[PDB]
Design a protein around this nucleic acid. Sequence first.
RNA 1: GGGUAGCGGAGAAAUUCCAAUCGAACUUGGAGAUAGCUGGUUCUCUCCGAAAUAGCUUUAGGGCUAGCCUCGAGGUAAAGAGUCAUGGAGGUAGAGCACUGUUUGGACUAGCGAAUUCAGAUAAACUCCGAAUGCCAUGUACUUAUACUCGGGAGUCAGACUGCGAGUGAUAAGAUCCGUAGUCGAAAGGGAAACAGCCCAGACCACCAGUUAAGGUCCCCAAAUAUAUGUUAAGUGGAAAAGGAUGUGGGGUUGCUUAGACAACCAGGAUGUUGGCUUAGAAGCAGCCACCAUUGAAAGAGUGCGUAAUAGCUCACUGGUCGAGUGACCCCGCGCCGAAAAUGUACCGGGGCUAAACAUAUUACCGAAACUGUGGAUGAACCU
RNA 2: AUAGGCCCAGGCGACUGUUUAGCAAAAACACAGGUCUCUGCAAAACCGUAAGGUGACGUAUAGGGGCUGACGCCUGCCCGGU
RNA 3: UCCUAAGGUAGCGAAAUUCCUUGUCGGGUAAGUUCCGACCCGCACGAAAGGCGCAACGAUCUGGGCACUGUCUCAACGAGAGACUCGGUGAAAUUAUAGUACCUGUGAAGAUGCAGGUUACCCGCGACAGGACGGAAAGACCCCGUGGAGCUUUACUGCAACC
RNA 4: UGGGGCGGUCGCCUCCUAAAGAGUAACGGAGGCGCCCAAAGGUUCCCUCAGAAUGGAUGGAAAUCAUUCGCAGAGUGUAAAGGCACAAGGGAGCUUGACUGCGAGACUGACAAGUCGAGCAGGGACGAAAGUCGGGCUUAGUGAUCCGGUGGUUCCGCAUGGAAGGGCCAUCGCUCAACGGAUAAAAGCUACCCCGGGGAUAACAGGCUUAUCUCCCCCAAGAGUCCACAUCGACGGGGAGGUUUGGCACCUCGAUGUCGGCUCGUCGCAUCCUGGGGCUGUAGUCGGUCCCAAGGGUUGGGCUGUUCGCCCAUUAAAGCGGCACG
RNA 5: CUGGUAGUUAUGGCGAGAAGGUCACACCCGUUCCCAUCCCGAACACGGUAGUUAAGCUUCUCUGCGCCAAUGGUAGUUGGGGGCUUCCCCCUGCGAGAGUAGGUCGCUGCCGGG
Lengths: 133, 76, 418
Amino acid sequence: LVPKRVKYRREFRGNMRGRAKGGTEVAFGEYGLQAVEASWITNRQIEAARIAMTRYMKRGGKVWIKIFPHKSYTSKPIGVRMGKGKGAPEGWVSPVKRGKIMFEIAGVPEDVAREALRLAAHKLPVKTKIVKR
Amino acid sequence: GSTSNGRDSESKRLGAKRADGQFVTGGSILYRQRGTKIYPGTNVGRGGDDTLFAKTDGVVRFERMGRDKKKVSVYP
Amino acid sequence: MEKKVLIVGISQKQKDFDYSMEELANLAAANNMEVVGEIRQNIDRENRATYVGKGKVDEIKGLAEMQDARLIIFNDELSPSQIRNLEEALELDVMDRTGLILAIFANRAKTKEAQLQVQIAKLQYELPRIFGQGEDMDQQSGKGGLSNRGSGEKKIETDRRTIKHQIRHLQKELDMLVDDREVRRRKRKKNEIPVVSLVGYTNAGKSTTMNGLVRAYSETADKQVFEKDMLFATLETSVREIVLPDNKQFLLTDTVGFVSKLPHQLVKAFRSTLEEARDADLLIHVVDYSDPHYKTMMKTTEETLKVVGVEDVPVIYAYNKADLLEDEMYPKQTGNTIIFSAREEESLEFLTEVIRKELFASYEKATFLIPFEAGQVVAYLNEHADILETEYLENGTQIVAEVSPADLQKLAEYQVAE
RNA sequence: GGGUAGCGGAGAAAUUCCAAUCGAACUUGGAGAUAGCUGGUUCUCUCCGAAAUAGCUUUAGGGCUAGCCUCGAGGUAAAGAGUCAUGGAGGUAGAGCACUGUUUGGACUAGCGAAUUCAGAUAAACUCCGAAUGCCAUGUACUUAUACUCGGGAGUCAGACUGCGAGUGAUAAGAUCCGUAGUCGAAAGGGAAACAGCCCAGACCACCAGUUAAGGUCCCCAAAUAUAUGUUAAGUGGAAAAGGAUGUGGGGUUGCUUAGACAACCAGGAUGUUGGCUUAGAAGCAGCCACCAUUGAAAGAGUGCGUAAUAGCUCACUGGUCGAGUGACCCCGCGCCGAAAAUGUACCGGGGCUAAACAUAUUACCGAAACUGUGGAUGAACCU
RNA sequence: AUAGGCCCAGGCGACUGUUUAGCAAAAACACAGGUCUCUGCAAAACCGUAAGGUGACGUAUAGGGGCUGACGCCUGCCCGGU
RNA sequence: UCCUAAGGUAGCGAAAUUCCUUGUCGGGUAAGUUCCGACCCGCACGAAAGGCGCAACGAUCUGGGCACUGUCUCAACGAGAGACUCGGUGAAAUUAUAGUACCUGUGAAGAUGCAGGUUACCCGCGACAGGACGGAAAGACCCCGUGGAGCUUUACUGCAACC
RNA sequence: UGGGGCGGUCGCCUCCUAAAGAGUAACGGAGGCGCCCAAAGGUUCCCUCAGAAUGGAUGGAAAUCAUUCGCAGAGUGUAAAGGCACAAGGGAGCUUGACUGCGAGACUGACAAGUCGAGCAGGGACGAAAGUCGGGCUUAGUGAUCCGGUGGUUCCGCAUGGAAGGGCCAUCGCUCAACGGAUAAAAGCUACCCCGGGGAUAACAGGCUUAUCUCCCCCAAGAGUCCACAUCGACGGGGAGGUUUGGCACCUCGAUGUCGGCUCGUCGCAUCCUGGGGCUGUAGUCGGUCCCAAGGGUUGGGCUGUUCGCCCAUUAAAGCGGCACG
RNA sequence: CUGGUAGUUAUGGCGAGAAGGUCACACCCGUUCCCAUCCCGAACACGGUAGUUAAGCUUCUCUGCGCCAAUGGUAGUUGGGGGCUUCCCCCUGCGAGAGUAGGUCGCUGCCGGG
Ligand SMILES: Nc1nc2c(ncn2[C@@H]2O[C@H](COP(=O)(O)OP(=O)(O)CP(=O)(O)O)[C@@H](O)[C@H]2O)c(=O)[nH]1
Ligand SMILES: [K+]
Ligand SMILES: [Mg+2]
Ligand SMILES: [Mg+2]
Ligand SMILES: [Mg+2]
Ligand SMILES: [Mg+2]
Ligand SMILES: [Mg+2]
Ligand SMILES: [Mg+2]
Ligand SMILES: [Mg+2]
Ligand SMILES: [Mg+2]
Ligand SMILES: [Mg+2]
Ligand SMILES: [Mg+2]
Ligand SMILES: [Mg+2]
Ligand SMILES: [Mg+2]
Ligand SMILES: [Mg+2]
Ligand SMILES: [Mg+2]
Ligand SMILES: [Mg+2]
Ligand SMILES: [Mg+2]
Ligand SMILES: [Mg+2]
Ligand SMILES: [Mg+2]
Ligand SMILES: [Mg+2]
Ligand SMILES: [Mg+2]
Ligand SMILES: [Mg+2]
Ligand SMILES: [Mg+2]
Ligand SMILES: [Mg+2]
Ligand SMILES: [Mg+2]
Ligand SMILES: [Mg+2]
Ligand SMILES: [Mg+2]
Ligand SMILES: [Mg+2]
Ligand SMILES: [Mg+2]
Ligand SMILES: [Mg+2]
Ligand SMILES: [Mg+2]
Ligand SMILES: [Mg+2]
Ligand SMILES: [Mg+2]
Ligand SMILES: [Mg+2]
Ligand SMILES: [Mg+2]
Ligand SMILES: [Mg+2]
Ligand SMILES: [Mg+2]
Ligand SMILES: [Mg+2]
Ligand SMILES: [Mg+2]
Ligand SMILES: [Mg+2]
Ligand SMILES: [Mg+2]
Ligand SMILES: [Mg+2]
Ligand SMILES: [Mg+2]
Ligand SMILES: [Mg+2]
Ligand SMILES: [Mg+2]
Ligand SMILES: [Mg+2]
Ligand SMILES: [Mg+2]
Ligand SMILES: [Mg+2]
Ligand SMILES: [Mg+2]
Ligand SMILES: [Mg+2]
Ligand SMILES: [Mg+2]
């Protein structure tokens, strides 16, 4: 998941104070993963979690991803000093505040849903919980 | 490594130069702006680069014309 | 997205030089790159400084700047000085065939055995090239004088030592992994199951043959092996049981494909991987008979087997894709050659018949008399050997069947003389 | 015994030699060369007391003007500071999708797919909205002591850490660069074991007087082996995460039970029938399709072990003996594992502690150069 | 008591000689030989303001300067630029 | 065929020259990143700043042998001169005052001297060097100063000399 | 100037950072300027844009025409921001105010400079008056002094009349771009080097940090002849250590000797051998993996200055690290 | 009652449904004249009034859109104090945006005519 184009190539890192602005309720499916803490979540982590939870269900039901990696971050190589401008972009990240629902699923029974969400939550750097509509 | 940035312009010190309810003398500058962010009112003139100035002696009043706009006047 | 590349080649007295550029274009198309132009030069010797000569460099630069390319790919291995010169002359990025194959292998390496192999191959390839690459920073001309305080060494020694060190660590991890791998072969070696291995060129049809055989003669036949045209599809070896209708057991293994003009830093990885084929009991050489160039392929195939170190193993040359050819009959056996189509029941029947004929040849006739109350041996005979006829006698069961020497020795008490 | 003399001589050439001196000898003079650099600069007490910033600079460890200190003198329609009331300018935090970018799932679609709609997201350089604070004025309100102008004399232009708001960096650094407040600098005293910058608090002098602050009250070591109600068993307290777990306490739901529950003990656990197919077999228990009926309290076309198939063992289920509870889930408190480094215990200052630990509430005392008591010295302003 | 250790093979410099008094003895300098160039005699060149000198009490088979460095085989193409 | 003033000839070549490089093959050794002989993809040889050879010569540099041995395995004994004790004579570098332990910590971030602990009767003589960031020499490296000196040139401005 | 060098930059304008007044730094994130216009200036009068649907020859999705919807989705010389539909946008008529002398009072500001300005006088342009006009919707489009050139002038003019020469007013001559401009005029080497200073600032070691590094784990798709967990384990996730490659510049420049070896060791345990054990894809033999365990032990040579490494021959074994790389 | 002309943050607007009149207003008829069209008496200008409320205009009714808008809660935050510091918690004062109860089919002034 990468944006097709951006207005600017560099951006401030921001902060993560407060509860999530919107998206704190299950709105499309029956089950969801909710963030209990705040964290940067990259697109590799999203992809790994999605593949795990989709493979467990054998391509049955539906999955909604409720977060997008809009923000970019940069870096500097080993051996360069401080200064001489900002570094080059590396990846894309989504800042997720506490209370945000980040994955929803539908179309499967209790056991399959809960086990798929448990398998997905182990790929993520944030502390999660499972909620039902 | 190079930045290719680093330029800026000198600040121009815009905004309100006198207070609401203050007594002011003729010719005093009341407000500096780009465009008519505030309009000239009674006894107030608009300069060539949009500067608002007092034309007489009196007290400054910032007022609200029709819903979306503002103006400033000077009353003896 | 997709990068625009160019491919550059010299005749170099190669016998074909055309299939080489074709497969180079195919390899580029397997790395999310597309060929927007090729340059060839018919020079019998390679230029020492730029690999193509002075004028060809300008021609290549003009074509790249007209076609808007981002990288140049050279058909042969380059030299560090050649790379420096070409990069300075072209003001672009330069890459060679070895780098391309390493790039193909790196992103298809899933199991960490392959990942570590590609990692060590990449570091070995880049180790000689760092000299002039790092000299630009190192050759700062002005650094100092005598100091009475310092490292007692020159920077070149220090960075040489640093780059030398990590190679040993990576190779050590490789060796530990291979030693751990030898543990999982203990059961196979302790027993004496015959092993037959499929080898050949890429996209020959090895995986399809294995999948057909597994579907025909396996218990857990749902265990299939991936198949596709693409490129190096299988990067790992697989082992499966095959049990024949006459109650015989063997193990079938599948390995990776290779291509011509193979790097020497990666042939070590292939030699590590083909260690199962090295200790095989039978070899099956799959050849794409449809392709006109198939003949050339066969030769280069043996070359690879000559380098990894597998020899003196009986080989049956199987010619796949018989259905794609008109006016041909199959399956057919001629000497040690088989003509057949992998996606056929009858072709697989013929191939497995040939395999059974070749491997098992010491199964001779023998007659046994198993007493009734002292039974539980007829079950062993029926589940470990193929029977012909049995009789219900008053004193017991009189069986006749064809068996192996181990069964004869184990059942030596029940034999009856004639 | 003689010749070549320093803007010079000699050199089979090394910057080699020209009186222990040579990329340009020695001596005297110009001469006290110049040194925006380092070092040094000698008696006492009283009052006040900084800066480490802006701009320009062949400027960057130098200077100049301004800012900040001190001394003297002036003038008032009292101009300085705090709070209160009132009026304004201004788009940050938050929020939102009305514009602009980024973006998810449907319906519909010009033709897999542009638009329209439905629902749902996101923003330093988006805004239909929009604070708290801070800022500018007015007042006759209440309190409080400066403010300004002119002149003489300066020093300063390396700052540091801590809290809060940002950038850079890796949402590293006792990092770097700004904004805002504090302390150090230039500040002693008490507490943090020791410990510029943290917490408390500003030393005029003397006393073998009192009360308090932060921090404390078992011994080192001054003061509680204090009071009440609970928690913890790790020395947790006195170091460390994702994950893992019948530790332990407090709540809230729910099933069965003295017409007998749960656990053990006794007995039964059968018949068509080896259900059909497949297999050399397949008899409940390799595998596929079915899962009925009878007696009876119940008893599976079988829960597991066992044979090669059997055989054999066991369970589901029912009756019998004793007669009190028993089994599922949710929330909260404190604990457990994960947990490894180099001279010597060495991750409470020590001894030691099961409270001398933790939670809630309460009350005495100790504790400073703070404040008070008594006696001295001294500056300013204003009065007699 | 005093009185050569020897052999095989390679780089460099032909050789004897000279050198950084007091850190470097050499593969560096010199060298015999080669070649280019200047100079008709009050020679060119060099010292000196000059006078006066060296060259030389010499006269192109002589004298000054540059480069190479015994000897053997050799020393190719370019006169656009300076 | 394009361009150039013209496109490196002979000879030699992993070299006092080769980055990759311990190039590849062979010799020599049980084992040879050095050495010798070949090869030629000469990063970046080359013809009087001479190319390639060469008998004799060298306190030159490099590799291998015979002989020889305390160089070594691995050290032992003996002689003399100092050291050591006694009589005579008698300095120096250095030095803020000193009744001058160890461990863990703290601190301008590496403590004899600060904290908490652990050891420790007073004064010497012969030895050894872990510390006193030991002594000696206002760091030669590095940076700075609108410091200096020697040298270069198609830097600037000059001067001699010559035409 | 996160040592100096290399690279980049040096003056002016617009936005973000900037914390809702103004101001505010970094070799922080983004873009422009060194002009143009004789109308694209002044005034008087008039009126309104982009796009879409529909209907029609060449004509086509889009050229011209007609109706309807249409708050600006257009335009505004040019970058951006703030403005503007009572136009500051678009047409037409007449014009030269893109005037001369000034200027109460303010903004900005160390200075030098920069910005706004009602109103007064002279003489005008356009309008029937009222009235507007000292360039352009606003904010960039620029360079001090000294020295020279040109035009004007009821100024001076070394005994006197003139003249030569000056003064005053207007204007011209700078990539003086290192843009407050040292001179009218200026590039390099020092390993032959010297003096004054600095831990204000680099090279060794110490300190902080832990991206990288070494080690240990969580989930479990897969491999393992069936079989996630004998042995391994992808995509992702979490820590410990302080030996690597780095970052910072806190002690030391009135000196903290810097690689390898030799001599002499001592400590940690993440254990190379030996001792005890659990699991095994443990029949036996030979092994694999994990737990306890630091008592002792842990080789001689060839090549290379080497550490490392490769090779020869052994051994029960030929451990890995700290101590100023002891 | 109507014509003209002002003020007032759309509670005043958009949309829909009807009534009315040459007293005023307008549409309408014409182009000799002043004046006009990059062409057109459409508009502008002028000269009259056969027909008309069809439209503008005036009056009345609708909440469909639009606009206005509480209360309580929540976010944020000045000051004071703590943690286990990607951040969080407590006390005091201030206090949104969104959403909603509800409001709205205007209200005031001067002049000339009926
Ligand atoms: N007509 C025909 N096509 C065949 C036959 N056998 C195989 N193919 C085709 O050739 C392809 C073979 O692919 P595959 O067997 O996976 O190649 P591979 O050998 O595994 C390549 P790798 O070495 O990377 O594993 C298949 O996609 C199949 O469609 C045949 O007998 N006839
Ligand atoms: K998680
Ligand atoms: Mg150097
Ligand atoms: Mg001299
Ligand atoms: Mg010499
Ligand atoms: Mg000398
Ligand atoms: Mg100072
Ligand atoms: Mg101090
Ligand atoms: Mg203190
Ligand atoms: Mg008690
Ligand atoms: Mg985890
Ligand atoms: Mg609990
Ligand atoms: Mg029971
Ligand atoms: Mg614990
Ligand atoms: Mg713990
Ligand atoms: Mg523990
Ligand atoms: Mg601790
Ligand atoms: Mg205690
Ligand atoms: Mg008193
Ligand atoms: Mg007193
Ligand atoms: Mg007094
Ligand atoms: Mg010499
Ligand atoms: Mg001769
Ligand atoms: Mg000569
Ligand atoms: Mg003579
Ligand atoms: Mg001559
Ligand atoms: Mg000469
Ligand atoms: Mg020459
Ligand atoms: Mg000769
Ligand atoms: Mg060899
Ligand atoms: Mg050899
Ligand atoms: Mg050789
Ligand atoms: Mg030679
Ligand atoms: Mg010779
Ligand atoms: Mg010879
Ligand atoms: Mg001789
Ligand atoms: Mg000789
Ligand atoms: Mg004596
Ligand atoms: Mg003596
Ligand atoms: Mg002590
Ligand atoms: Mg003593
Ligand atoms: Mg200077
Ligand atoms: Mg000198
Ligand atoms: Mg205009
Ligand atoms: Mg000048
Ligand atoms: Mg030199
Ligand atoms: Mg270092
Ligand atoms: Mg260090
Ligand atoms: Mg010093
Ligand atoms: Mg050796
Ligand atoms: Mg052994
Ligand atoms: Mg060490």
